[PDB]
Design a protein around this nucleic acid. Structure first.
Ligand SMILES: [Mg+2]
Ligand SMILES: [Mg+2]
Ligand SMILES: [Mg+2]
Ligand SMILES: [Mg+2]
Ligand SMILES: [Mg+2]
Ligand SMILES: [Mg+2]
Ligand SMILES: [Mg+2]
Ligand SMILES: [Mg+2]
Ligand SMILES: [Mg+2]
Ligand SMILES: [Mg+2]
Lengths: 117, 88, 14, 55, 106
RNA sequence: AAGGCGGCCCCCUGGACGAAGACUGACGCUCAGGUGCGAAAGCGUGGGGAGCAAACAGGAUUAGAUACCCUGGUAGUCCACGCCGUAAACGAUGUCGACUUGGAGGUUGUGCCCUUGAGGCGUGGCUUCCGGAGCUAACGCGUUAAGUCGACCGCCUGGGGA
């Protein structure tokens, strides 16, 4: 219904959940898929295999725009950083750019307390 | 402390020549003009207690130098206390 | 330990 | 002696993300290392070197 | 007397007003016994990161040897004028007369 | 000086250290009371308010959860103006001076040298790790002493009560 042919993947990687989101170069969102609704809950949600099927399912909803060259924007220190990039190549795409966009503050705000166990 | 024109002049004011710079009466005048230079500074900067340590050092340094001339020759002592406005 | 300290106050006998 | 204007010297002393390389890797003197640190921070205000590789 | 290096950049849409600002600020400095050592125009210059949503900033580099009279007024008229978006002054060690590496390469 | 102090730039201002000489001539050391500074919390007045976070709200946990964990959240954290003057305020070593084998370094200068390289040779200020003699109850200290001495001041006299 529309042709853009330029993808941007703002993928999220937290310790609890990994979120894959395809968008364009101009901020207009094109589709998302989270590992919480992929049949993975809690401990199964914090698995790198959950990021393997989340990237493939989000890619299946953005093939209506005919995207061939995409950019990968990696955001977060969570696991699954490798399993979500290889799933983009298994979905029949031409990988062009991979960029770490993890936010690093310059000691802006105070971090929370420790979690002693 | 001061600039070069302010330092070399007061040495020539109170010294016998240009080499008369190490004597006690010159050293009082170096501390007297410096405390008089810092009158308007510490009024505006009362929260600067670190520069106040340098100020109170020169007050204690000048008091020890006035006690040396007073115990040796009171003739030169009574000259300098009114020439700089001392004894309050 | 100093003799001049004991000039002001001697050793306090219990 | 060193100055902020010669950015080609500053290109040899930063990373691709604009991060300052310490004297452990380059093996420079510690007198210049404090001078090179403030020289980049002058160029950082004047938009001569990028802060991060984000923008 | 102090030695200042005055760095100020000009809005790129008013780059023709730059030679007006050169000689108006010069007469106020040199009248009160202010020397001058370097006056170099660079034109537009690509930014390392965008500031005030603009690109291709104009750069003018200066060296002014002058007392503390002009350091009070000139920093206020930089904030008063809207053409100068960034103003930066710094104290140097001596009066210096040397071409910048931007002029020696362009 | 210590508690401490970290974006950049300007203004005001403090001490420390090195080189070359000139100059005053013991002008010094030390410190009871006294004086000032002094982490953070807290208090008074008036502002300010992101984030974090006592009390507290809610959910799990549990025998109970008051705590832990999680979602929120006031005082406070921020600034001005005071007051409070306590810390494991520790190098757990009061200050000052004099000497007594030394290395690995760091920092900061200075002097000379086929400048024959940011080097060679010295020589002061600051600082860490080893270690001989010696000392110490051991641990360790060991040219920055807890080695050998001098000058002065503070403090301790079984534990608990306290
Ligand atoms: Mg000074
Ligand atoms: Mg003599
Ligand atoms: Mg209260
Ligand atoms: Mg809690
Ligand atoms: Mg309050
Ligand atoms: Mg106590
Ligand atoms: Mg220790
Ligand atoms: Mg031994
Ligand atoms: Mg040892
Ligand atoms: Mg008792």
């Amino acid at each position: 219904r529309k042709q853009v042919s330029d993808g941007v993947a703002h993928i999220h990687a937290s310790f609890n959940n990994t979120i894959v989101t395809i968008t364009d170069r101009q901020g207009n969102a094109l589709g998302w898929a989270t590992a919480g609704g992929s049949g993975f809950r809690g401990s199964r949600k914090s698995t790198p295999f959950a990021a393997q099927v989340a990237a493939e399912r989000c890619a299946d909803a953005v093939k209506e725009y005919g995207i061939k060259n995409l950019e990968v924007m990696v955001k977060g220190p969570g696991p699954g950083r490798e399993s979500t990039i290889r799933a983009l190549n298994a979905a029949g795409f031409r990988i062009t750019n991979i960029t770490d966009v993890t936010p690093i503050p310059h000691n802006g705000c105070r971090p929370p307390k420790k979690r002693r166990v | 402390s001061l600039s070069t024109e302010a330092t070399a002049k007061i040495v020539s004011e109170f010294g016998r020549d240009a080499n008369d710079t190490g004597s006690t009466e010159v050293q009082v005048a170096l501390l007297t003009a410096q405390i008089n230079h810092l009158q308007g500074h510490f009024a505006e900067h009362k929260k600067d207690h670190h520069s106040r340590r340098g100020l109170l050092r020169m007050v204690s340094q000048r008091r020890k130098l006035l006690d040396y001339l007073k115990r040796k020759d009171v003739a030169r002592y009574t000259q300098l206390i009114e020439r700089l406005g001392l004894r309050r | 330990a100093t003799v001049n300290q004991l000039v002001r106050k001697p050793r306090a006998r219990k | 002696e060193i100055d902020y204007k010669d950015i080609a010297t500053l290109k040899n002393y930063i990373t691709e993300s604009g991060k300052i390389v310490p004297s452990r890797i380059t093996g420079t003197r510690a007198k210049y290392q404090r001078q090179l640190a403030r020289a980049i921070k002058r160029a950082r205000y004047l938009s001569l070197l990028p802060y991060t590789d984000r923008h | 007397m102090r030695h200042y290096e005055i760095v100020f950049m000009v809005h790129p849409d008013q780059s023709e007003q730059v030679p007006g600002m050169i000689e108006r600020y010069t007469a106020a400095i040199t009248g009160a016994e202010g020397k001058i050592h370097r006056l170099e125009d660079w034109g537009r210059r690509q930014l390392a990161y965008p500031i005030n949503k603009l690109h291709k900033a104009h750069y003018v580099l200066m060296n002014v040897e002058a007392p503390q009279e002009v350091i009070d007024e000139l920093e206020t008229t930089f904030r008063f004028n809207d053409a100068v978006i960034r103003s930066m002054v710094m104290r140097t060690k001596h009066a210096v007369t040397e071409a910048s590496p931007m002029v020696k390469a362009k």
